[PDB]
């Protein structure tokens, strides 16, 4: 079934030592166990509550953690892979908690006294001024269930005026209440995720904002130390707000493959022709590339000599460019042939090889701390 503790209660539950990655509630965790004490300890959990702790480490090398997530096992199977006899276990994140004590046992397995942090659920912001006669005008005549009719901000505009009609009884306008409204915040995200990657919004994302906020915290392209901030937030509203602030702070692009190398920033983008900054170009072998033009990029190595052969930008010669770290292909460096060419050198990055990320300040000369918003 489902084993769940009460809010704000102290619980003492074991921590698996091999685990280190942050577990967001809702997302699934598969594990591979070889050690007998790990297996024996998991076997005992199947008899009892089936729940263990997955910490959110701030420094995994020192094993420093202030919060984490409980994990409920739901799948157990003693498999064999590569001539090794291993147990494969699947668990799911459930409750959040605040780390209190980290007593380590006689085994390598260590116990953890911890206090369950509750999921803070707030009623409608306008519910606070009593559900009176304008209440019957609060509910909507269904949704348009149309991708094109519900993108109509004409619908989202009628949504705001009607949901927050009572805004004039308070000291703040309707549009401020929209900035704290989950459905609005959710759709603000969806519109920006679809901007990053085209995909079906209906199937891929859950409709519940608590499920939505957590699901997005998992798939956001961010460091797990930054992800700890999202794990602390108890209100799906503040969580959705924070994720929007992050999304707006992801102004740079890194290697999609290694994700350790900041290539370029959005500032460096530019439209070479009226075609746009990004366009789809073809090579002489039938390969199609969505190419982004940027003035400056770094942490790249060049391959081969420049060639004008089948150049997408006449007057420029391309040189294949790849990531400094993993050598996956990132694009091309375009260099002008003549002196009267306007930028003289620029870069053509293929989109599928890039991934947006927050500009890191690995230069410790000016490391101003990133402040997330609620």
């Amino acid at each position: 079934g489902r084993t769940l503790h009460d809010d704000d209660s102290c619980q003492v539950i074991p921590v698996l030592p091999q685990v280190m990655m942050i577990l967001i509630p809702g997302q699934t965790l598969p594990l591979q166990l070889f050690h007998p004490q790990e297996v024996s300890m998991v076997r005992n959990l199947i008899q009892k509550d089936r729940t263990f702790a997955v910490l959110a480490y701030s420094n995994v090398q020192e094993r420093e953690a202030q919060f984490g997530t409980t994990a409920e096992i739901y799948a157990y199977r003693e498999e064999q892979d590569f001539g090794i006899e291993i147990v494969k276990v699947k668990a799911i994140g459930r409750q959040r908690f605040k780390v209190l004590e980290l007593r380590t046992q006689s085994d390598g397995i260590q116990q953890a006294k911890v206090q369950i942090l509750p999921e803070c659920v707030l009623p409608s912001t306008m519910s606070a001024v009593q559900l009176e006669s304008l209440n019957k005008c609060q509910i909507f005549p269904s949704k348009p269930v149309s991708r094109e009719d519900q993108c109509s901000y004409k619908w989202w505009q009628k949504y705001q005026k009607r949901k927050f009609h009572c805004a004039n009884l308070t000291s703040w306008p309707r549009w401020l209440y929209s900035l704290y409204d989950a459905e609005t915040l959710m759709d603000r995200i969806k519109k920006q995720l679809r901007e990053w990657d085209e995909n079906l919004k209906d199937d891929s994302l859950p409709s519940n904002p608590i499920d939505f906020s957590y699901r997005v915290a998992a798939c956001l392209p961010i460091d797990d130390v930054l992800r700890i901030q999202l794990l602390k937030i108890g209100s799906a509203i503040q969580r959705l707000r924070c994720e929007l602030d992050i999304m707006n702070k992801c102004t740079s692009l890194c290697c999609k493959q290694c994700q350790e190398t900041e290539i370029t920033t959005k500032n460096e983008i530019f439209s070479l022709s009226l075609c746009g900054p990004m366009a789809a170009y073809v090579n002489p072998h039938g390969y199609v590339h969505e190419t982004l033009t940027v003035y400056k990029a770094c942490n790249l190595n060049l391959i081969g000599r420049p060639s004008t052969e089948h150049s997408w930008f006449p007057g420029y010669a391309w040189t294949v460019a790849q990531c400094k770290i993993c050598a996956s292909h990132i694009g091309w460096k375009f260099t002008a042939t003549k002196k009267d060419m306007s930028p003289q050198k620029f870069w053509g990055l293929t989109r599928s090889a890039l991934l947006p990320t927050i500009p890191d300040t690995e230069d410790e000369i000016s490391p101003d701390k990133v402040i997330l918003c609620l």
Binding site: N283, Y287, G304, R305, V320, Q322, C326, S328, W332
Partner: peptide, 28 residues
């Protein structure tokens, strides 16, 4: 050093065959 081993995907030139094979595998 005339690099007659070309990748049809990105265009990289290579000077021996087996080096290009290492390359086209990273594309996947």
């Amino acid at each position: 050093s005339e690099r007659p081993f070309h990748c049809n995907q990105c265009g990289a030139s290579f000077t021996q065959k087996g080096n290009l094979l290492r390359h086209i595998k990273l594309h996947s």
